[PDB]
Amino acid sequence: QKVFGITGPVSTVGATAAENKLNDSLIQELKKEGSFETEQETANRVQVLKILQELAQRFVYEVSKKKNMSDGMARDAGGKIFTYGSYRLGVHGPGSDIDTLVVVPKHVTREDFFTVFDSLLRERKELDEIAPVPDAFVPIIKIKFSGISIDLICARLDQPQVPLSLTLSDKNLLRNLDEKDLRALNGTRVTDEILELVPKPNVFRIALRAIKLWAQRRAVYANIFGFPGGVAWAMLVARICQLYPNACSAVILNRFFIILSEWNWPQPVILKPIEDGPLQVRVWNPKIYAQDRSHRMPVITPAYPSMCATHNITESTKKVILQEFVRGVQITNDIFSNKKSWANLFEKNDFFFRYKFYLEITAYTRGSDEQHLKWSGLVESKVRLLVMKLEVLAGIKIAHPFTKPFESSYCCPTEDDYEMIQDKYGSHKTETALNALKPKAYLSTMYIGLDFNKEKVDIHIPCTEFVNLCRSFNEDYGDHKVFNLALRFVKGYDLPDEVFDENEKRPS
Ligand SMILES: [Mg+2]
């Protein structure tokens, strides 16, 4: 049974009463920490999805009519919404976006999605916000609609109709699709497979809710900065579910930390045998592809074509993940022996207390929210490259990127003030000299914690290269009247208080 994975179960023993009690405690702690939304919020999501399906049909219909098709053929053309990622898995929370895919027949172009479908959304009274990003890895429209955040992508099939009955599991659907359409289909195909690959979906969901919370709190969740993201975490949980098909989620978590802490990296985590299929694309294969051999902690997607979802993991972030696995073993063991609580497991990281030195990376923009989102996105996208350059330097013991940029915005009349913002920010010694308060200047700041092992050592070259790289991406970047980029080396005693919550106090 594929549900027991590629190695067979470790144990088919069922949960005991004591284990189920630990599981009840685990669920109550998840509830206390806000993991679950209300029944009303779930209803609200279901309603917006009905509307999205209606609009997806209307979109395909309108495009079809514009290309001179009869009413019947335009109806027949169809159009269908799917969800993927956390909502589709049922592990979403009150804040969560719905990752949503719009699948359209062959005559409906990506251009049509960004014009006709985009306009259909803008005509709705329920639309709160809309931000099209036709450039992203997967071209996307991000919206808020009746208060719910929806992330919308589009895939064009090589068939003239998209009926309501359509499922995406048939790998023949991938024939004749361009790279972007393949990418677009991959998310939903993988999510759907993960669900079919675990022995008991609700055990999986509770375990994954816990790992998502744990990973966010422990600052090991962010694919962009070299940590596993949602799909990778989902697959790691799924693997352990297969090994203990009759276990309770609390037991899955204990076994998870142990197994992954002890695992023989770079040996891969795989949920089902790697499939071949009808395309000429490479499937993950460290035997024959040197890039694949380089993956440090490979977590491989099950849907054809299999790929490594954790390719971004670096030398430094691997160490952090493994450290966090070890803490998890210690703590869950203690919870099982009734010495510690689930709340102990989910305690927030102490990133800003644990290093003597930090590198601050600040992306400034003076203009619209749009070009800042684009600029910072760009700068944010390169941070992992700086980490890889820093971490291989002789003097550097670790270069540990934080997982979330600190965001800020300001009243910036001149022209002068933008200059003054770039100056007093990043150090607690000079930061107080800000206000008001908060025409606008944006900031995104990433932090890299540094551990060094005649002192120094000199990190300025990779830093300068990083700045030059980010400026290179177009002539605008590039400017200096609008876009700017700063790297600052700070001691821990001198970190800005944006970095501590009103719950901790700064070290010295
Ligand atoms: Mg998302």
Closest CA to 218 of 207, 227, 231: 227
Which residues touch 460 (CB under 8 Å, ≥6 apart)?
Answer: none
The residue among 334, 349, 364 that closes a domain is 349
Q: Is 50 annotated as a binding residue?
A: no
Centroid of ligand 1 to alpha carbon of 386 (angstroms): 25
Give the residue numbers annotated as catalytic, written as ranges.
86, 97, 99, 151, 212, 221
Q: Are residues 204 and 286 in the same domain?
A: yes
Q: The tokens of 354 are what? A: 């644990």
Residue 505 covered by a domain:
no
Ligand 1 centroid distance, CA of 130 (Å): 15
Alpha helices by DSSP H, 294-338? 315-336
Q: Is 143 annotated as a binding residue?
A: no
Q: How many domains does the chain have?
A: 3
Kind and range of the H or E element at 489?
Answer: strand 483-491
CATH number of the CATH domain containing 359: 3.30.70.590
Same domain, 92 and 185: yes
Distance in angstroms (rounded) separating the CA atoms of residues 47 and 59: 18
Do residues 228 and 309 make contact, with C-beta atoms less than 8 angstroms apart? yes
Would you say 221 is a known binding-site residue?
A: yes
Query: Do 242 and 218 share a domain, yes or no?
Result: yes
How far is it, in rounded angstroms, from Cα 76 to Cα 123?
Answer: 24
Does the residue 118 lie in any domain?
yes
The reply to whether 370 falls in a domain is yes
Q: Given phi > 0 = left and psi -120 to 50 = alpha, else beta, which region is 375?
A: alpha
CA-based max dimension of the chain: 80
> What is the distance in A from the centroid of ligand 1 to the CA of 172?
27
**Is residue 363 assigned to a domain?**
yes
For residues 304 and 428, membership in a common domain is answered with: no
Range(s) of the domain holding residue 326: 1-36+193-349
Residues 153 and 247 placed together within one structural domain of the fold: no
> What distance in angstroms lies between residue 149's CA and the mean position of ligand 1's atoms?
9
CB 358 within 8 A of CB 448: yes
In a domain, 78, yes or no: yes
**Any idea how long the chain is?**
508
* Same domain membership, residue 98 and residue 8: no
From the number of C-beta atoms within 10 Å of its C-beta (0-12, 13-18, 19+), residue 162 rates as buried
**Residue matched to tokens 């929806």:** 150
Q: Is 151 annotated as a binding residue?
A: yes
Q: Give the up-direction half-sphere exposure of residue 92: CA atoms within 13 A in the CB hemisphere.
A: 23
Separation of CA 228 and ligand 1 centre (Å):
14
Cα 99 to ligand 1 centre (Å): 6
Q: Examine the domain organization and report whether 343 and 361 are in the same domain.
A: no
Resolution, Å (one decimal): 1.8
Residue appearing with tokens 């074509």: 305
Say which CATH number the domain at 96 has.
3.30.460.10
Closest CA relative to residue 402, chosen from 451, 440, 350: 350
Q: Establish whether 230 is an annotated binding residue.
A: yes
Q: Per the domain annotation, does 164 fall within a domain?
A: yes
Decide: 281 and 305 in contact? Cβ < 8 Å: yes
**Do 432 and 489 belong to one domain?**
yes
Where does a domain end: 147, 168, 192?
192
Question: How big is the CA angle at 225 (ends 221 and 229), to the nearest 5 degrees?
Answer: 35
Experimental method: X-ray
What is the number of other CB atoms lying within 10 angstroms of the CB of residue 367? 16
For residues 170 and 138, membership in a common domain is answered with yes
| The residue to which tokens 């702690």 are assigned | 29
Q: Which tokens in the block code for residue 181? A: 């359409």
CATH number at residue 339: 1.10.1410.10
Break the chain down into helix, strand, coil percent, rounded to 5: 45, 15, 40
Among 192, 227, 242, the domain boundary falls at: 192
| CA pair distance 242, 117, nearest whole angstrom | 41
**CA distance between the termini of the chain:** 57
| Calpha distance 74→28 (Å, rounded) | 50
240 annotated to a ligand binding site? no
Question: Could you give the CA distance from residue 128 to residue 433 in angstroms, rounded to a whole number?
Answer: 36
Alpha carbon of 144 to ligand 1 centroid (Å)? 13
428: CB partners within 8 A, 6+ apart:
493, 494, 495, 496, 497, 506
Enter the tokens of residue 322: 């493994």
Query: Position of tokens 């719910």?
Result: 148
Angle at 173 between CA 171 and CA 177, to 5 degrees: 115
Amino acid at 338: N
Annotation-wise, does 212 bind a ligand? yes
Structure tokens at 327: 């803490």
